[model samples]
Target: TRDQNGTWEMESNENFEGYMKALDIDFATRKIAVRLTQTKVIDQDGDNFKDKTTSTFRNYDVDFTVGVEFDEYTKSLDNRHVKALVTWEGDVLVCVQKGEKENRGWKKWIEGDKLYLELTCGDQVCRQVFKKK
Candidate 1:
């Protein structure tokens, strides 16, 4: 998505290790995650899309159209199940995950040359930023 007249180049990546660590992933998992080259493939058709995060260890897939609610599986990460809804708040992609943890979910947005992500689980919140390559 273009914002403020600049083309959105999705070439940035972050330290997945940090994210896994923040989620309290075990040592073996963290090691595997750190070595993984995660790629996000977004297949868009109008407002509907299939967003997939693929890695050496696991692949996470979520299919949603705008304004539609869906179930999401964390798969490898703790294997927690959540009911998720993703919507656009301006150009930012916001997600609300309802399940065992109160006020849990994540949001993603592009800011200038950077991509910003906010992850929340219960009371613990982790912020991640990636620079466009």
Candidate 2:
């Protein structure tokens, strides 16, 4: 149950450009991001997971365990460092990243047959929908 390998296809994305802009992403990067076809692959093992966000321009790898703290690097987004903690709130996976930026983090939940994600940075919030593959 906890350990499952799954691929999620992005169905819809919102505020992606705004979140990137808040991170000081350049015009070219923003353009690429908006047009990018991002795929998220998650390899779950018990309460631990290895997540990869891949695109043509860049790839991000992050490994974390529930209730554990770890350092995260936003390599494509200004390469800033942040401390993150992931936990399960009901059926949703909640992540809180603490750093220089306010309200920085993400949350993921499954509704029906769709995966919903909320990305937050500063005052901007981006919502993305994903369909299981």
Candidate 3:
């Protein structure tokens, strides 16, 4: 399987502004977010997992078990309330969120010692790459 544990430092974020705009994240925070460096801390224990999206401007975090649905408050970023469900698509971790927005979700995976993440909301998608830290 894809072992996506440990911390990863972001190398790049692509088209992130559009994704943030779709989320309607607070203006001040979004401004900082687009420019800030971000890191992801992932802890995996079988089906149970916790992940942190860390940035100097703001941090977003999530905790859930694989194959289980949970009520996830999108925390300091968008502050959106969502019902989050997680599942495995091959070795990748896929999150499907049910909320006010359509076509909203996120995915994470490991590729050649790097972490790849893509976040989608409505018509916008953001892709990010991270190196192992």
Candidate 4:
């Protein structure tokens, strides 16, 4: 199965600002976030993964295991805490975030050397494409 284990540079983000608004992100931070570029670095082994979302303004780190649930804190993003559980469906890594927001989660997959990420909150979904670096 394909797995994420390298640095991925963000190329494009579609409706990301809308998704952030659905999470109640402040206008100031949302504006900076929407304008800044992001990079994802991932280290994976077996069912374990260490992921980092990096930007010029902020960074977020999380560790997760397949079939295991853990508390996820968004200290730099929205500050809304949630329980995150990750699972593997074929080559896709799907995470379901349990919190006050409905249908909050994200999915990641690789297509050749390109990585695709989809962030979901409520009915809003943000699609981002990344190139392997």
Candidate 5:
């Protein structure tokens, strides 16, 4: 999936603050998070993938193989440990984070040169679009 690889610059974000609120993130982090620009870089080899999300305020990186479950500790973000699983649903990569929060997961897909991410926590959803760089 070349469309999902390489660096992606964030184009727009929707309801990200609401998603953070639902996770009970701190006010200071939320304020900085909403204002900071994010960059995503995805590296894939066979069924394995290494994903990176970076911003001036913080950076998060995760690596996993498809159809396998791994322990993920969200450090600077919500600060939680969860069992994360990634699976391919057609061309979309869907992740389910099993933790204290319900409906906590995300989906990543590519359309043309744009990458889309839908992050869900509780009933809140944050939609983010990124353009290939």
Candidate 6:
């Protein structure tokens, strides 16, 4: 089993504007969010994990377990919420979000010292990379 811990600071976000659009985010939040420095704090113990994302303008926190399903809500970013089922495929963490979006999900992985996150909504995919300080 593979586990990741500590804090990961966002290095870059690619096509995040499109992601905000898909989430029906407002123009002002979209503009400000894409420009803010995002930091993710990941605490893992076996199959249980708490992933908290923080930025200067907003914050998001979630606690989940591998292969378990939970109701998720999006705040400070978008209003569309979903029931998310999370699992591990190889070394990547896969999240399948079910709600108004079709095949919406997220894939998180780590390579070397870098953390990679991809958000998928409809046919759009937004990639974000992070690094430790």
TM-score for all models, in order of appearance: 0.56, 0.58, 0.57, 0.58, 0.59, 0.58
Query: Which ranges in model 1 have alpha carbons more than 4 Å from their true place?
Result: 1-58
Which residue segments of model 2 deviate by more than 4 Å? 1-55
Each prediction's total of clashing residue pairs, residues at least 3 apart in sequence or on different chains, is 0, 0, 0, 0, 0, 0
lDDT of each: 0.78, 0.88, 0.88, 0.91, 0.91, 0.89
Q: Which stretches in model 3 have alpha-carbon errors above 4 Å?
A: 1-58
Per-model root-mean-square deviation over C-alphas: 15.4, 15.6, 15.9, 16.0, 15.7, 15.8
Task: For candidate 2, report its TM-score.
Answer: 0.58
Sequence-dependent TM-score of model 6: 0.58
Please provide, for model 6 over 33-101, each residue's C-alpha lDDT reduced to its tens digit, 9 standing for 90 to 100.
Answer: 886888899999988999999886546778899988999887655767899999999999999999998
Which ranges in model 4 have alpha carbons more than 4 Å from their true place?
Answer: 1-55
Q: Which stretches of candidate 6 lie over 4 Å from their true place?
A: 1-55
Better of 5 and 6 by TM-score: 5
Arrange candidates, best TM-score first.
5, 4, 6, 2, 3, 1
How would you encode candidate 4's per-residue C-alpha lDDT over 18-89 as one tens digit per residue?
Answer: 999999999987978887778999999978999998885546778778999999988877889999999999
Please write out the lDDT profile of model 5 over residues 6-116, one tens digit for every residue.
898887889889999999999988987897778999998877889999875546778899999999999867889999999999999999999999999999999999999
lDDT of 5 at 23: 100
lDDT (Cα, tens digit) per residue for candidate 3, span 37-115: 8789999988788999878654666668999999988766588988999999999999999998899999999999899
* Residue 63 lDDT (model 3): 69
lDDT of 3: 0.88
Quality of model 2 by C-alpha lDDT? 0.88
Clash count, candidate 5: 0
- The residue pairs that clash in candidate 6, if any, are none
- Give the Cα-based TM-score of candidate 3 against the true structure: 0.57
